[PDB]
Amino acid sequence: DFFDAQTLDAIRHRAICFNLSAHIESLGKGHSVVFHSTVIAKRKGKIKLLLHWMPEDILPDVWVNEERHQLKTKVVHLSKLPKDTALLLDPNIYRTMPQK
Amino acid sequence: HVQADHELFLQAFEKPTQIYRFLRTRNLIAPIFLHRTLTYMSHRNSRTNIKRKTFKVDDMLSKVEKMKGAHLQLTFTGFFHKVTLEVLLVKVCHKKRKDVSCPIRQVPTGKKQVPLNSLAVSSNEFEPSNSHMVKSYSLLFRVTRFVAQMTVFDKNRRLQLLDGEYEVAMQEMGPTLQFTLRWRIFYQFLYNNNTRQQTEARDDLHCPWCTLNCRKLYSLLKHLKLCHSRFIFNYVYHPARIDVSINECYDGSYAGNPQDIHRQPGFAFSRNGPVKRTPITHILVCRPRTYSSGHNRLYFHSDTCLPLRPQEMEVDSEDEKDPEWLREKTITQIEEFSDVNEGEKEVMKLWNLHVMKHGFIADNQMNHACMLFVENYGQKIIKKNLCRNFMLHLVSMHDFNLISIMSIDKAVTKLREMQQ
Amino acid sequence: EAAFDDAVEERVINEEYKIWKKNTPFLYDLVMTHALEWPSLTAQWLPDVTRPEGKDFSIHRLVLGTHTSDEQNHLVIASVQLPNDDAVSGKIEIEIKINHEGEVNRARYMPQNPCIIATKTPSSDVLVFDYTKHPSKPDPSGECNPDLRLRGHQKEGYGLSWNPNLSGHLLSASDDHTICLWDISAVPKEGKVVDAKTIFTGHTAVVEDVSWHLLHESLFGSVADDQKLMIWDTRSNNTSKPSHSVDAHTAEVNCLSFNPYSEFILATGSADKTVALWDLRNLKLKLHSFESHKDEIFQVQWSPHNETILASSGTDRRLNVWDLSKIGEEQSPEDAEDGPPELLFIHGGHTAKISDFSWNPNEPWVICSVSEDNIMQVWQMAENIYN
Amino acid sequence: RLQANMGAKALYVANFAKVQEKTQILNEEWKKLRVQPVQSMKPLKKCTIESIFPGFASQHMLMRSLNTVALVPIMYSWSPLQQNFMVEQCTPNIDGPNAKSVQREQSLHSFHTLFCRRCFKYDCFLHPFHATPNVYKRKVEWTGAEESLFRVFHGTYFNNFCSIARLLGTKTCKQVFQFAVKESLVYNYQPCDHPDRPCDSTCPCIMTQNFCEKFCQCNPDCQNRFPGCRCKTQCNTKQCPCYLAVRECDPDLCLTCGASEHWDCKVVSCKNCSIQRGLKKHLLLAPSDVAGWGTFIKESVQKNEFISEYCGELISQDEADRRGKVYDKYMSSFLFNLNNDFVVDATRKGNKIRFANHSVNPNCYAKVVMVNGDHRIGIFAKRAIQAGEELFFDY
Amino acid sequence: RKPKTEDFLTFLCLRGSPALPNS
Amino acid sequence: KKCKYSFKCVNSLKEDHNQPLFGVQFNWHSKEGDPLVFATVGSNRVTLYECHSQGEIRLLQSYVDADADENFYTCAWTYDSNTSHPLLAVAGSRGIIRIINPITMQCIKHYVGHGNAINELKFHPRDPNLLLSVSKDHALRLWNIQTDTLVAIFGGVEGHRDEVLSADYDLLGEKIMSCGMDHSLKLWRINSKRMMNAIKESYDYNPNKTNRPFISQKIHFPDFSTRDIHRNYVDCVRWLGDLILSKSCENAIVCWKPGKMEDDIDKIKPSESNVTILGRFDYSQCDIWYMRFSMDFWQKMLALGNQVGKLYVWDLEVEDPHKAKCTTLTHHKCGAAIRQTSFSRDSSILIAVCDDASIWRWDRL
Ligand SMILES: [Zn+2]
Ligand SMILES: [Zn+2]
Ligand SMILES: [Zn+2]
Ligand SMILES: [Zn+2]
Ligand SMILES: [Zn+2]
Ligand SMILES: [Zn+2]
Ligand SMILES: [Zn+2]
Ligand SMILES: [Zn+2]
């Protein structure tokens, strides 16, 4: 009891959306978010490329030198991410209860 | 195996594993209790309390002491697509308690015409103040006739982008712009005692849906037994065999103050402000069973079956002060009698209401009971002229040897003294 | 939008509470989940103790506040039965209930005289009770009998602290940019109302915690919602300039606590999702920032029986406890996946805002905690964890 | 035979007239109101409605959930009780104007036949018939009502003129004397009638395998009667005389325990007369975690403590058999056999203790007790029970 | 057997929703 | 007389679930000239619907509960006194009585005091706050939703000895009739001082001001009972001024009243037994249980369905009810049983439900 279709359908939809956006079960092996890089900007002396990730802006625009091919798809554990911005994946992960 | 029970089985193993798949990410990113601290799971820990013996807090500061042992000329360039451009400093501050959105401040410096198909000087205008308020400082490039930002200032006051020439993309609401900066187990499911599915564990001991790397089988068995209690697990060495089975006797409830269940909207939560509940005392371990004193479950009224508020439980104890339907039945039963007079029925219902309002089983107490009647309904009988049949009822009970006759004399004299 | 998110979050919190109720008999040596008739924004163990030699369980005493609505507030002095080294029995009993002016926000007992208990109010006039003089039951009329009133603020607050060395010296805070300091030892017994012996006003925001320094009575510390900590020297005759002033945090600071064993080291807990450790010899450098809590912290208390242990709690519904000796130590990867190494335990048995918690000064590694949802838990971690 | 068709038509048109003007004033009342119309949301599940008639398009709309609610088990209607139940010349008023003379036996005919000894009520719900009329037997202007009053008064007093003169008040001693000068010329308890004979084998009490009581009109020097206990303590042990048999304490006979004290208080020494005084625990209703509903206890108790007493309608064996055959469809059998004569049926009426369930590991139990002849139930505790715990006892 | 444990749950978690988890 | 009614099937919708419907009620409380609205209900699927002159039944709202096993039975419409908003009232097999506010599209209120399934809901006509509810648990209930509590219980030891199937107020709101499977048509009263001051104390109730429970005024003694009007189950009963109309599985409507023809309705004793069968209306093929008839606000006519599909209509303005001209309505597609019909405020629109998820419409011409 205390778990009806009203909460279950929303949980299923949000989990399917998170799995489509992250590919946890497919590529992540159940315990890793799989981010994909993008060609955001570049700056030449020594070259340096700034890349923004695929799913959202939770991660920063990371700079790299000439392992650009190795960073095409990066797996990373959930706990390894920053605690201050790991909530945008699904907002019911943690939310303040009284709100005031 | 028809499709009906197959889909029922599928849904019955879909809802708890969906809840556990959500709780996987929840306890990974927001754990409930550290798995290292469990007694049956301590191999995950990789240290002991040796360093606590030799530690000294006052000598800590010297250690961190040995750990402690610009003209921004932003020059633009010709774009690469198929106009004017303006630079701006985007200061993103820290999240305050009152606000939920981060403080953002866009200081535009100035616009300048640039070709397609100028520069801006900043002589140390960070304006961070060193007050632990500037979380980030980005450089936004607005255009028209594609806008985007880039993190300039790092967390530790470090530089992200390099100097010299550079280029960056943009997005309205390939096309880009240029500039120049310069400073083996196996689960055996069972539903209705039917081998609906048989599988084999891919990993050695990595949990299937929780995904924790435990290097022992007994810890995995105790975790599957304690956590994820919707299922029931049994294991026998026979390659390892695991017998999954639904628990159809779950304790699904609110597990708290349940009086908020029967509010006006469905399953309200009175988190804002206080709320009363009944007291309880649950104790589960003293020196490693359970023991729950008090009451922690909702109640319902007897006759109405409406929800019972916790405020009125001891006060207004129902089932006392006997109901009115029994009084109406005693009325209508003797009123249905044919060969009885009016005043006789009147004093009969008065005596019934008297003995029901104050129960009397003791014989000698009946000598007091009549003395209550004139003290309880005497003014009624003078309002109806029932004294003669009242004395008749007195003599009737006297015929059964329940009371003495001088007591009846005292009763009638006391009744007629106040009547005058 | 938000209501459905709160509802499904309450469902998930109930599921996690059931999981905790299932898994709790392998983590703690003692557990006592008690619910009160009304909630409590304050909880503190008292130093008195009774040990019947015939029985196996000892008796301890708790001071508790209340926060009601359309009902009289009863400050509670309660008792509890703790098994010592043996035995599955023990219950909660309410000894004394005293009618209180309005709700309660903070309450602290005098370490010199444990009978004297200072308490705050939702108005300016804070007060001080002595339950030995009061009767063992409340007055049904509701007219409270304050023993020693105290005034000087213009609004409510949360800060309150007794001076451990000097008797009567009592500090209190309020969100009207004032810090009151009283000394009740000087007034006669006939005087039931006392004016502000002094008021300090150096902050420029809502002050939210103060505390006397333990081994030096001539100064104290404070933290406010101006992202500021301020160490105030009592010897100086200037109630504006502090002894030290530091921007110790990025957001509003909520709580502070000094060490019982040491004298220089202290800890703070702030609203930027962090606890911080500081030293009273060089307050410029931030020594360390413990970051596992994910919301506003509201209480931190050093342990009495240990030096290198710290605690914290807030509206995250998970009480954290840390070990300082385990700081900066290398550990396994899977050990790091659950949390940092210094993080010793996460008691997540609650289902609401952890409003207050406290330690016992005569039992090892045991604490009490009170939440806003009428929950009062008590627990002691297992010996196998800390050893 | 059929002399009301035109009358029925008249009544129908009158009905049409009054319901028409009623609807008219209802329309006048409704016209004052001004309520808003419904407004739909801009179009997760779906719901589509087709149209069998061509010319109308298929109308789609996204679904909208509703807030769930806590289900409770099934309960048929009932009402509370505290006592048991059972289901199977005019002589005008003395105070009225049309009163007439009547003898003593005929005047008190309706009173003595309806009055009951074991409960002190008139036409109670457990005593269908009175035993015998021999139980009450012992060793100027004048209206018929005054004649009957003087008759019954002189019958009880046997010509004590000053006492009737005191009681009546209006009539004097000399008038009553002058009038009297010219007047001469495992079975249910059942009280039996054999005043002349002693208690012998023909009496039904020994046939029922039960001891006599005060209510029987037998010899007071008999042996079959059950004297009360003589224990100063609470007498809740096996050594008490009443605790040997199934009977409880007596109000009048058990003077040593102190059962005849005032019933206003509750602190009493005798821990056995709780059924008579009714010192029951404040039970409560809840949903059980085994099968449907259940009863919870508020205050803590101890072993062999008095929880409550079962109550319901007393009926015959075949009566309860047909009642259970009827309730087999509704599958709610709250029956409880009392003895060979009568049994309890509590589906329609009862108390909270009915709602307990059956289990292999009980904690409470039941016991039959003959309180003043009435074979009542007593639900006691077989184990130390904490507050808010479930109660179970085998039927 | 040939169907592994994780393969079943992934198909199971989706419950026919279009997550496209290799089946 | 002729039929005097030009009825023609304008629309016949069919839903996408194939579950038999159980009730339908129009929004009589709405004002004049607005877009008219009604609502049907299935087992776990309630659907609001509009209606236009050209048969364009525009779908407006459709709510569904999470518990699929619930079986809804009836619906009702009400207006609020203070907010002046509409309110749907629904119930089902779970023992719950929900109140939907269709503007906000939420479950604003719900009440639970029954053991088993609800059979019908009604609202007091003059005072719009009261809410009578029939149930299978051998008793009725009365709620007050302005103060969110219960008022009284019209049942007990003297109530029906079987499942209660239907009930209805009179038009003025001073006397209630109730019928069920126990072959009893029992009268009630809401005009005495007890019910009036109980309703007043319910209006004056507040759990925050005082600290007490509500004194529920039970009623274990109806004012009239009878077990001779019918033999089989009594599926529906209604009021017509001071007359009782009723149906049963005997395929006939009966119009009668308590006591003799001259006996007034407001002076009948509890021990009254005599009756007066004033008239009867004949029809066929109504053996199945849970069948209903319907009237308009003016009660100028009457509509009924049967277990085949060929619905029937009767007049009420003319005299001689047993000689009144009936009317039939058929079609070559209503191959299912009809459960309920209803009209709007005026007699212009008629809508009926059936067990094949079909919703038929008829209109004057
Ligand atoms: Zn797991
Ligand atoms: Zn009796
Ligand atoms: Zn005998
Ligand atoms: Zn005898
Ligand atoms: Zn005898
Ligand atoms: Zn005895
Ligand atoms: Zn006795
Ligand atoms: Zn005794």
mmCIF file of C-alpha atoms in Angstrom, chain D residues 157-293:
data_model
loop_
_atom_site.group_PDB
_atom_site.id
_atom_site.type_symbol
_atom_site.label_atom_id
_atom_site.label_comp_id
_atom_site.label_asym_id
_atom_site.label_seq_id
_atom_site.Cartn_x
_atom_site.Cartn_y
_atom_site.Cartn_z
ATOM 1 C CA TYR D 157 -50.304 -2.798 56.661
ATOM 2 C CA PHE D 158 -53.116 -5.072 57.972
ATOM 3 C CA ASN D 159 -55.187 -2.291 59.572
ATOM 4 C CA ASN D 160 -52.618 0.161 60.980
ATOM 5 C CA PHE D 161 -54.834 3.233 60.850
ATOM 6 C CA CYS D 162 -52.289 5.887 61.854
ATOM 7 C CA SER D 163 -49.910 4.797 59.086
ATOM 8 C CA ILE D 164 -52.532 5.121 56.327
ATOM 9 C CA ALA D 165 -53.562 8.438 57.899
ATOM 10 C CA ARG D 166 -49.948 9.616 57.655
ATOM 11 C CA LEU D 167 -49.440 8.359 54.096
ATOM 12 C CA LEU D 168 -52.678 9.603 52.518
ATOM 13 C CA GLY D 169 -52.624 12.889 54.443
ATOM 14 C CA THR D 170 -56.031 14.082 53.255
ATOM 15 C CA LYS D 171 -57.835 11.110 54.809
ATOM 16 C CA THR D 172 -57.831 10.990 58.615
ATOM 17 C CA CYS D 173 -57.472 8.046 60.976
ATOM 18 C CA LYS D 174 -61.093 8.185 62.159
ATOM 19 C CA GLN D 175 -62.500 8.268 58.616
ATOM 20 C CA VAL D 176 -60.379 5.295 57.528
ATOM 21 C CA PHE D 177 -61.384 3.418 60.689
ATOM 22 C CA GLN D 178 -65.095 4.083 60.126
ATOM 23 C CA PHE D 179 -64.694 2.939 56.516
ATOM 24 C CA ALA D 180 -62.834 -0.235 57.524
ATOM 25 C CA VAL D 181 -65.555 -1.040 60.083
ATOM 26 C CA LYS D 182 -68.094 -1.320 57.208
ATOM 27 C CA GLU D 183 -65.779 -3.169 54.767
ATOM 28 C CA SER D 184 -65.511 -6.741 56.068
ATOM 29 C CA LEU D 185 -67.924 -9.498 55.047
ATOM 30 C CA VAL D 186 -24.423 -25.805 30.998
ATOM 31 C CA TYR D 187 -28.058 -24.619 31.058
ATOM 32 C CA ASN D 188 -29.646 -21.229 31.634
ATOM 33 C CA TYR D 189 -30.832 -20.277 35.110
ATOM 34 C CA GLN D 190 -34.615 -20.255 35.657
ATOM 35 C CA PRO D 191 -36.358 -19.513 39.010
ATOM 36 C CA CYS D 192 -38.684 -22.352 40.020
ATOM 37 C CA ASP D 193 -41.730 -22.581 42.311
ATOM 38 C CA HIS D 194 -41.866 -25.144 45.137
ATOM 39 C CA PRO D 195 -42.333 -23.248 48.428
ATOM 40 C CA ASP D 196 -44.083 -26.009 50.367
ATOM 41 C CA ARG D 197 -41.800 -28.804 49.146
ATOM 42 C CA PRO D 198 -38.000 -28.789 49.717
ATOM 43 C CA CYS D 199 -35.355 -28.578 46.988
ATOM 44 C CA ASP D 200 -35.544 -32.113 45.549
ATOM 45 C CA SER D 201 -34.858 -33.953 42.281
ATOM 46 C CA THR D 202 -38.035 -32.602 40.646
ATOM 47 C CA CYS D 203 -36.719 -29.026 40.893
ATOM 48 C CA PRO D 204 -35.213 -27.814 37.569
ATOM 49 C CA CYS D 205 -32.158 -26.244 39.259
ATOM 50 C CA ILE D 206 -30.513 -29.586 40.060
ATOM 51 C CA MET D 207 -31.599 -30.795 36.606
ATOM 52 C CA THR D 208 -29.688 -27.872 35.061
ATOM 53 C CA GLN D 209 -26.532 -28.794 37.074
ATOM 54 C CA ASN D 210 -26.514 -25.323 38.666
ATOM 55 C CA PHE D 211 -26.855 -23.989 42.201
ATOM 56 C CA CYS D 212 -29.845 -21.982 43.383
ATOM 57 C CA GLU D 213 -29.699 -18.230 44.069
ATOM 58 C CA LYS D 214 -31.539 -15.535 46.019
ATOM 59 C CA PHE D 215 -34.080 -15.074 43.210
ATOM 60 C CA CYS D 216 -35.599 -18.520 43.766
ATOM 61 C CA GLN D 217 -38.388 -18.623 46.370
ATOM 62 C CA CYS D 218 -37.282 -21.940 47.916
ATOM 63 C CA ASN D 219 -36.505 -22.565 51.590
ATOM 64 C CA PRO D 220 -33.844 -20.125 52.921
ATOM 65 C CA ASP D 221 -32.440 -23.045 54.987
ATOM 66 C CA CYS D 222 -31.568 -25.007 51.821
ATOM 67 C CA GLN D 223 -28.203 -26.467 50.768
ATOM 68 C CA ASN D 224 -28.438 -26.149 46.969
ATOM 69 C CA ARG D 225 -28.191 -22.348 47.233
ATOM 70 C CA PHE D 226 -24.784 -20.771 46.585
ATOM 71 C CA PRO D 227 -23.578 -18.533 49.461
ATOM 72 C CA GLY D 228 -21.244 -15.728 48.498
ATOM 73 C CA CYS D 229 -17.506 -15.611 49.008
ATOM 74 C CA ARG D 230 -15.896 -14.770 52.365
ATOM 75 C CA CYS D 231 -12.478 -13.511 51.198
ATOM 76 C CA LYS D 232 -11.187 -10.185 52.504
ATOM 77 C CA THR D 233 -8.674 -9.853 49.644
ATOM 78 C CA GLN D 234 -9.548 -9.328 45.962
ATOM 79 C CA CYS D 235 -10.539 -13.051 45.675
ATOM 80 C CA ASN D 236 -9.163 -13.403 42.114
ATOM 81 C CA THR D 237 -7.597 -16.814 42.985
ATOM 82 C CA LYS D 238 -8.754 -20.429 42.839
ATOM 83 C CA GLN D 239 -9.212 -20.651 46.632
ATOM 84 C CA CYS D 240 -12.238 -18.325 46.571
ATOM 85 C CA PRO D 241 -15.583 -20.193 46.811
ATOM 86 C CA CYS D 242 -17.099 -18.283 43.884
ATOM 87 C CA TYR D 243 -14.048 -18.953 41.687
ATOM 88 C CA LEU D 244 -14.499 -22.737 41.990
ATOM 89 C CA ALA D 245 -17.732 -22.591 40.010
ATOM 90 C CA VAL D 246 -18.118 -20.249 37.033
ATOM 91 C CA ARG D 247 -20.107 -17.721 39.097
ATOM 92 C CA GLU D 248 -18.915 -14.210 39.962
ATOM 93 C CA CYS D 249 -19.321 -12.275 43.206
ATOM 94 C CA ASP D 250 -22.704 -11.362 44.745
ATOM 95 C CA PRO D 251 -23.636 -7.775 45.765
ATOM 96 C CA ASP D 252 -25.486 -8.664 48.990
ATOM 97 C CA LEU D 253 -23.989 -11.994 50.084
ATOM 98 C CA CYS D 254 -20.291 -11.181 49.524
ATOM 99 C CA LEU D 255 -19.958 -8.746 52.428
ATOM 100 C CA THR D 256 -16.389 -9.749 53.348
ATOM 101 C CA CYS D 257 -14.880 -8.546 50.061
ATOM 102 C CA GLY D 258 -16.885 -5.301 50.285
ATOM 103 C CA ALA D 259 -18.904 -5.488 47.072
ATOM 104 C CA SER D 260 -21.866 -3.590 48.603
ATOM 105 C CA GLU D 261 -19.895 -0.315 48.852
ATOM 106 C CA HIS D 262 -20.815 2.826 46.918
ATOM 107 C CA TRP D 263 -20.464 2.400 43.148
ATOM 108 C CA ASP D 264 -19.622 6.062 42.427
ATOM 109 C CA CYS D 265 -15.870 5.459 42.794
ATOM 110 C CA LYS D 266 -13.670 2.866 41.045
ATOM 111 C CA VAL D 267 -10.924 2.007 43.584
ATOM 112 C CA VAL D 268 -12.399 -1.165 45.134
ATOM 113 C CA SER D 269 -10.917 -4.255 46.760
ATOM 114 C CA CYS D 270 -13.028 -6.912 45.011
ATOM 115 C CA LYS D 271 -11.413 -7.522 41.598
ATOM 116 C CA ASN D 272 -14.258 -9.830 40.447
ATOM 117 C CA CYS D 273 -17.442 -7.670 40.360
ATOM 118 C CA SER D 274 -16.259 -5.625 37.355
ATOM 119 C CA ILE D 275 -19.017 -7.140 35.195
ATOM 120 C CA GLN D 276 -21.745 -5.848 37.516
ATOM 121 C CA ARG D 277 -20.179 -2.417 38.047
ATOM 122 C CA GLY D 278 -18.931 -2.267 34.448
ATOM 123 C CA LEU D 279 -15.291 -1.214 34.899
ATOM 124 C CA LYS D 280 -14.387 -2.048 31.308
ATOM 125 C CA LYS D 281 -11.280 -0.829 29.507
ATOM 126 C CA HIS D 282 -11.657 1.929 26.912
ATOM 127 C CA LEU D 283 -11.292 -0.151 23.761
ATOM 128 C CA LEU D 284 -10.954 1.422 20.309
ATOM 129 C CA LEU D 285 -11.667 0.454 16.696
ATOM 130 C CA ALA D 286 -8.995 0.122 14.007
ATOM 131 C CA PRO D 287 -8.189 -1.854 10.836
ATOM 132 C CA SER D 288 -6.481 -5.127 11.718
ATOM 133 C CA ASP D 289 -3.295 -6.284 9.982
ATOM 134 C CA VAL D 290 -4.615 -9.889 9.677
ATOM 135 C CA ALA D 291 -8.200 -9.834 8.376
ATOM 136 C CA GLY D 292 -10.359 -6.726 8.189
ATOM 137 C CA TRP D 293 -11.202 -4.800 11.340
#
